[PDB]
């Protein structure tokens, strides 16, 4: 998975190291590899990568690089 | 260690800017989840702003257009930018550093803020 | 917001709970409850985070809760040493970022 979302352009998407997405996954806007498209997208709003409930109660401010 | 020293704090009259500065020494700004949390005389604790490690910023809806969040990498400083200040704002601002969750785990020591004539 | 009662007045040895009472946005939504206490002219300490666990330092005595759509911390075998304004912290995401509660103040009776 860390070659496989690194080959999706996830590490350091808007400002999002990979081994936050990496973590993200252990723990019609977007119209439809198609889940990381949409990840993208979801990114972008005004909540960036809390919109993933787990991500900021299980990433948020660890230490995320051990993931990869 | 781990030590969060502000400044810049003082007077300022209404409608008026001031920055503040947060020396952090233990640790890296840029490799940590770095926020503002206000106190105003005998109130609650208000979120004021949060830098990314990645460098993302978010702020109180009470703060938006008025503030901005900075940080020096180089300098291991915390900046806090204010404009168009109100009697409102007047308050104690504790430079934080997050822990997990967007929990808070250091604080300052604080810098009282006077918004005043 | 997150709400908190202003009070509470509990007795010494005996146990409390402080609850912390959300909203679909914030605790509905499931993001974790950390807690704070807050000494007379210091600054707030993180006593405990999401929703459970404790730092290093904090008394065994000190416990946290998470039920659906609310929060509530807990003291077995309360304390003089207690007498403290307590704050829950929560994420809200209409608003984009950290909530915090509005405060309860404890009172130790005896």
């Known amino acids: 998975l860390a070659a496989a979302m690194k080959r999706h352009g996830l590490d350091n998407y808007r400002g999002y190291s990979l081994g936050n997405w990496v973590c993200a996954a252990k723990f019609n806007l977007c119209n439809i590899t198609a889940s990381v498209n949409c990840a993208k997208k979801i990114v972008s709003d005004g909540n960036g990568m809390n919109a993933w409930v787990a991500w900021r109660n299980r990433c948020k401010g660890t230490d995320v690089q051990a993931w990869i | 260690q781990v030590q969060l020293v502000e400044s810049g704090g003082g007077l300022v009259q209404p409608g008026g800017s001031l920055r503040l500065s947060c020396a952090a020494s233990g640790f890296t700004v840029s490799s940590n989840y770095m926020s503002w949390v206000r106190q105003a005389p005998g109130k609650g604790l208000e979120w004021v702003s949060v830098?990314?490690?990645?460098?993302?910023?978010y702020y109180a809806d009470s703060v938006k257009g008025r503030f901005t969040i900075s940080r020096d990498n180089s300098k291991n400083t915390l900046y806090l930018q204010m404009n168009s200040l109100r009697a409102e704002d007047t308050a104690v601002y504790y430079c934080?550093?997050?822990?997990?969750?967007?929990?808070?785990?250091?604080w300052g020591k604080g810098t009282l803020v006077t918004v005043s004539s | 917001v997150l709400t908190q009662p202003p009070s509470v007045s509990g007795a010494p040895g005996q146990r409390v709970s402080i609850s912390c009472t959300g909203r679909?946005?914030?605790?509905?939504?499931?993001?974790?409850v950390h807690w704070y206490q807050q000494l007379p002219g210091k600054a707030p300490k993180l006593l405990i985070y999401?929703?459970?666990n404790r730092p290093s330092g904090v008394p065994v005595r000190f416990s946290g809760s998470k039920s659906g759509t609310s929060a509530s911390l807990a003291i077995t075998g309360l304390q003089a040493e207690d007498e403290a304004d307590y704050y829950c912290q929560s994420y809200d995401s209409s608003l984009s970022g950290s909530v915090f509660g509005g405060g309860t103040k404890l009172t130790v009776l005896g």
């Open positions: 830098i990314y490690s990645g460098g993302s910023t």
């Open positions: 934080a550093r997050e822990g997990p969750g967007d929990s808070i785990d250091y």
């Open positions: 999401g929703n459970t």
């Open positions: 679909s946005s914030n605790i509905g939504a499931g993001y974790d």
